Amino acid sequence: ICCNPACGPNYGC
DSSP states (O other), X not given: XXXXXXXXXXXOO
């Protein structure tokens, strides 16, 4: 569950 800015857009951390 990568919620980083580099990993992608707004994700459900």
